[PDB]
Amino acid sequence: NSSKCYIQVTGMTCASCVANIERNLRREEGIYSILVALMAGKAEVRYNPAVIQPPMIAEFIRELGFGATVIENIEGR
Ligand SMILES: [Cu+2]
Numbered sequence: 001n002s003s004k005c006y007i008q009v010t011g012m013t014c015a016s017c018v019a020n021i022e023r024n025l026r027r028e029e030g031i032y033s034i035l036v037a038l039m040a041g042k043a044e045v046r047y048n049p050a051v052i053q054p055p056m057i058a059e060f061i062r063e064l065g066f067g068a069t070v071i072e073n074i075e076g077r
Helices: 017-025 054-064
Strands: 003-009 031-033 043-047 068-071
Touching (some): 043 054
Antiparallel strands (some): 031 043
């Protein structure tokens, strides 16, 4: 079933961006949860990688939004 990946957006607390991004994503294209975690300062989309593609789901966010660095991992303290 649908898995997730993390994505760092170049300007999380721009604001509005994220409302738009919910509107972009929850439309369609293999998503079964949107990213957002602007509260921390990042994105975590839950999707299927077959329809859209892991590069593609990140990459798309560049052209309409902002620099979207993909992170198929999470670690820190
Ligand atoms: Cu913005």
